[PDB]
Amino acid sequence: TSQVRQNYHQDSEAAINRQINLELYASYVYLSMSYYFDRDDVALKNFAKYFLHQSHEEREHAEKLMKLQNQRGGRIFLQDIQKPDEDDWESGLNAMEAALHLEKNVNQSLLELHKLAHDKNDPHLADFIETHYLNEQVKAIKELGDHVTNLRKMGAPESGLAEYLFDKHTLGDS
Amino acid sequence: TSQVRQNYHQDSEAAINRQINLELYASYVYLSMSYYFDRDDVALKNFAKYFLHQSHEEREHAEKLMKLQNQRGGRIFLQDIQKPDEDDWESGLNAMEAALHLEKNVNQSLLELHKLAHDKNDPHLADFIETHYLNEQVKAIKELGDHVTNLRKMGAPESGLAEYLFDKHTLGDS
Amino acid sequence: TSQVRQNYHQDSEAAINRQINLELYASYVYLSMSYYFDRDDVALKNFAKYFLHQSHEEREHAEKLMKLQNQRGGRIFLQDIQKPDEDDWESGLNAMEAALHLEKNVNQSLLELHKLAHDKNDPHLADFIETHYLNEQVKAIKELGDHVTNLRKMGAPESGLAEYLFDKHTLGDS
Amino acid sequence: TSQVRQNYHQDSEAAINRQINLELYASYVYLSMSYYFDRDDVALKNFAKYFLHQSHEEREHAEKLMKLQNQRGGRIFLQDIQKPDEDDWESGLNAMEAALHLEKNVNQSLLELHKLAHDKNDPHLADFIETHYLNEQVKAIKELGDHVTNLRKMGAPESGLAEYLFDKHTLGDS
Amino acid sequence: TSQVRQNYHQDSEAAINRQINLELYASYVYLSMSYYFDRDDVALKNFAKYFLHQSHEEREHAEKLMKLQNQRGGRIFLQDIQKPDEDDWESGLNAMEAALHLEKNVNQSLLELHKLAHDKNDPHLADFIETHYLNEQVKAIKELGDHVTNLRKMGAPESGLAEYLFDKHTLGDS
Amino acid sequence: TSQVRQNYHQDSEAAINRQINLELYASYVYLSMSYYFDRDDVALKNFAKYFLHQSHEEREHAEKLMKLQNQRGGRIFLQDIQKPDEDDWESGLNAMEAALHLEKNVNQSLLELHKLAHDKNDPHLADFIETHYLNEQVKAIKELGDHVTNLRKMGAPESGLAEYLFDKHTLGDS
Ligand SMILES: O=C(NO)c1ccc(C(=O)NO)o1
Ligand SMILES: O=C(NO)c1ccc(C(=O)NO)o1
Ligand code: NA
Ligand code: NA
Ligand code: NI
Ligand code: NI
Ligand code: NI
Ligand code: NI
Ligand code: NI
Ligand code: NI
Ligand code: NI
Ligand code: NI
Ligand code: NI
């Protein structure tokens, strides 16, 4: 057992390892989406750029969790990163909706990790979760919901004009 | 009675107190609208930004009136700020039309305050009204009417595409 | 029901709406006080400046809560902003004491909102409260208590010299 | 009883006073170690510099707690600062191990102070602990464990060459 | 079938998809290694930094292949990223040797992809491989072999002093 | 016995160890006072700032003595730092008078340490005392006496106005 461990339950250690796999999964989903919008029969550069940013952000999420595992004295165990459910993401609107489902899934996973940390009276772990994950999740969810709302009111996905313009006017400056 | 008072009728003092309450009311209306466009099921950032600016401007209007009350020797009496008529503002076009009605209401209130000041032969009060309120009202009214006209010719509120584009191209730079 | 809502109790939603009304109320109290010190028969510019700053800060508090309501998926409902208990604030010392009572009231309201969020196992809401409200309350309370102590040891409110000097030497640079 | 106190248990007040004494104790331990490495028969400048930094950091920890006591309305009571267990710290490796034991002790003390604050439903106190102490403890513990590991793999304390080189290559730039 | 495809065999398309999975695998291996050196019982920051750089470089390799797939008209199909063979990488020397085996594996895969492209008379694909992969592989292999040689001549992995010094003097500036 | 020792009596070594404990004691006294003026029922920021500066200066005094002990070949032995006589310092005037008593005590201790060094014909030790302690003591004593005189002529401690103004006009710029 390691010299820095203190107040660190094994249930928490397992949970962090599960969360690492989840954040890498999300990274892979977003990479898949990004390059779907790179296809010559979709060709929406700013959708592609948007989801590529999200994919690198989730990779950083995963790395912060791994640093945390080592900080608290736990051992990293890595597992396979399952492939996204889809290879074809249909449309900008549909990709954004899958991103909404994804982030809500990841959010309930964090909220249970927080439940877990408060119940094993691990306040350091709890505040780590609050400070570095919980509000980033709320922000990501509000943002993807704003986008789904605008794509819908424009006429997406029935109107290809709507997705083109959304790509130029909303994902062209941030 | 106060040492600086001169040529300041009590009807005018009451009127300024009424006008303070009105300008705070307008501030509250615009705050309500601003955050309606912040909702994830409306998501029009630049509408929200537009009405938030107007709300801070009306708060400054109110403060200038309070400074004026104290300048002329009158006493400030504050009252409740009634809630906006609506919690849901339907659409960008409808919000803009409510803003037009609002500013015309506030304008007739100022025009009667000016009537009042000219009839109690208070030229300082009269020129205060002309210089700091009357033309700001005419400008605000022309501006909101321009906007209602453009939203209508675009197809608002039936076309969600129209409101999206108006938010990007007219309220995105000023 | 809205697409971004997750782990957000309706008791919490109601509570945020109550807290918004409270922070706007505080804003109105401080505006009232500010312009009482602007009167020609009180004439304490730096008291006025002090309470005007506090009033704009409480308006920002309210806006942050409204942004939060929309972020978590809740609906904003606004209510009347009741008028301050007083129109005449007697003196700098008395105004400062009313400000102390006010901030303690607002603080117990936040502490119950936090109780509520921890009991509905809403850690995002809980950390929002800790990070953006709780310590600002402790700071505001210590500050107003320091001031009440100094005004008292100087001879306020019996000595008008004391309030004059406090206005020049303590509220003249910060 | 003081005018700023709210939601501040007397058990918490006592606890902060205990924690102040503990953080000053740690400061004294590190000062002792620092100047042990200053001895002409040890002469490891960067060990000395390392532990002197830690000693000033613990003094700042103590001061932040005292500011907090006064902020929440409590009264500071100071006690004797007991002398370090040792006057002779044997070696760089041994000093680092005593520093590891020390910080773990201080950490369990903070974790109980947090337990205490959550149980007396003092969220301001709880978030203070999370934000300003808990993660600084985890960082300090990981750091001292990294160092103990490297000194051991080098051949410390049997090899005086190992400690010399560690002092030059690990504690010579940070 | 897609409008940009020309001279692009389906065997090549499959091969690029296999190579994408391989470059992501390598990325995962290096991430695993990086954070093994982050452990408090290994604590070799510059090994960790070294393998983390390699892991981000392999992620860029994968992305360049995906861009290429879309450029030539092929369709991206993603698969699971299998976990590294080990969770514990034993030592700096052993990690470096696994990195050598890895890059040679990836290199023979590229050399067969090139064989394939020259035999389906796809010169664009062939020169892509030469310009963006083949020489990066030769460089990576020479580099890891240099390192394995130096760690061995120093006394690794039997001497923990050797790995410490290698981490400071060879992976501390590049 | 140590290789650098020359002309260094054991009575002197003991004396330096006593003086180290004394300078740390003074540091603790001043910290106690500083945070007494931080209390919300005293609230004299510049008194607090004044005594906090003095407390860090005495900590530096102690460290210079410890460096000197090691320089001359002596061994540092640390002891408990006794708590200040008081937890409540009554008033600015009273705190300043306790500071005067304190510095005179420390001064006679240095003057005996100098007596001791001249009698064991240790001129290096003697000039160290003259150059780094004796005149700093005379300066500190004149300064605290100036302050006690001004607080008294103002009406302290009977007049809380006097202490307020002294805090603003004498301890507000130096
Ligand atoms: O503008 C006027 N005063 O400034 C004014 C209004 C009505 C009359 C009047 O009585 N005309 O016969 O004058
Ligand atoms: O009594 C309880 N469960 O039945 C309980 C113990 C600790 C807590 C808690 O975490 N309060 O914030 O609740
Ligand atoms: Na927290
Ligand atoms: Na070529
Ligand atoms: Ni994430
Ligand atoms: Ni709890
Ligand atoms: Ni107006
Ligand atoms: Ni006329
Ligand atoms: Ni507030
Ligand atoms: Ni500490
Ligand atoms: Ni070297
Ligand atoms: Ni590669
Ligand atoms: Ni001294």
From Swiss-Prot, chains A, B, C, D, E, F:
CC per GO annotation: autolysosome; autophagosome; cytoplasm; cytosol; extracellular exosome; extracellular region; ferritin complex; ficolin-1-rich granule lumen
Modified residues (Phosphoserine): 174
Compartments reported by the entry: Cytoplasm; Lysosome; Cytoplasmic vesicle, Autophagosome
Main location: cytoplasm
Catalysis: reaction(s): 4 Fe(2+) + O2 + 4 H(+) = 4 Fe(3+) + 2 H2O
Keywords tagged on the record: Acetylation, Cytoplasm, Cytoplasmic vesicle, Iron, Iron storage, Lysosome, Metal-binding, Neurodegeneration, Oxidoreductase, Phosphoprotein
GO molecular function, one term: iron ion sequestering activity
Summary of subunit composition and partner proteins: Oligomer of 24 subunits. There are two types of subunits: L (light) chain and H (heavy) chain. The major chain can be light or heavy, depending on the species and tissue type. In the human liver, the heavy chain is predominant. The functional molecule forms a roughly spherical shell with a diameter of 12 nm and contains a central cavity into which the insoluble mineral iron core is deposited. Interacts with NCOA4; NCOA4 promotes targeting of the iron-binding ferritin complex to autolysosomes following starvation or iron depletion.
Entry protein name: Ferritin heavy chain
Native organism: Homo sapiens (Human)
